[PDB]
Every structure is written in structure tokens, then in C-alpha cells.
Amino acid sequence: EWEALEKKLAALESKCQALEKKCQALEKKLEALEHG
Amino acid sequence: EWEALEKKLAALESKCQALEKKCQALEKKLEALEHG
Amino acid sequence: EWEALEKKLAALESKCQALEKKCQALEKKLEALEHG
Ligand SMILES: [Zn+2]
Ligand SMILES: [Zn+2]
Ligand SMILES: [Zn+2]
Numbered sequence: 001e002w003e004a005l006e007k008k009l010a011a012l013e014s015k016c017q018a019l020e021k022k023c024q025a026l027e028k029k030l031e032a033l034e035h036g
Numbered sequence: 037e038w039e040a041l042e043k044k045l046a047a048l049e050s051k052c053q054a055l056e057k058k059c060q061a062l063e064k065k066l067e068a069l070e071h072g
Numbered sequence: 073e074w075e076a077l078e079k080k081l082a083a084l085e086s087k088c089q090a091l092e093k094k095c096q097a098l099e100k101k102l103e104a105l106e107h108g
Contacts, residue, residue, distance in 0.1 A: 015052050016087050022059050023094050051088050058095050065102055
């Protein structure tokens, strides 16, 4: 169905946004090690 | 077409899941450096 | 609408591709710390 698709996409957008944050968090910890 | 969309979404869900694992793998290596 | 969906998916595919690169970039910096 069409609606199931809309929900899969919506959950993917969330997953993606949570991944961008995780990456920013990781980069921050990596930068701490790399400079200090 | 509708079916092409369904396939693009399915491949995106896989890509996303592989990215969550990569991030978990990275965080693990980062935590090793950060504590030991 | 159908077209709005197509655009959301297209922007998600980009976001995902940019995340794979970020992860590769991070892993590269992490590997530098881990071996050198
Ligand atoms: Zn740096
Ligand atoms: Zn830690
Ligand atoms: Zn290594």
C-alpha cells in the first residue's frame, strides 16, 4: 500500500538524522584525540 | 513507476542499516583509543 | 502527493551518500590514530 511507503520513508528520514548526529558526535571525540 | 520507488526505498533502508553498523564499529575503535 | 515522495527519497539518497563519505573520512582519521 501507498501509506506503508510513506511510513517507511518517514522512519528512514529519522534514522538518517540520528546517523548524522552520531557522526557529528564521533567526529567531535575524534577531533579531541587528534589535537589534544 | 511505483515499483521502482519501492526498490529505491528498500536499497536505502539497507544502506542505512549498513551505516549504523559502520558507526557502531567506528565508535568501538574510538572508545578503545579514548580509554586505553 | 506522489511527486513529493519522489523528492523526499531523492534527498534521502543524497543524505545517505554524504553520510557514507563522512564515515569513510572518519575511519581514515581513526586509522591514522590507531596505527601511527
Ligand atoms: Zn583535526
Ligand atoms: Zn569514551
Ligand atoms: Zn586499524
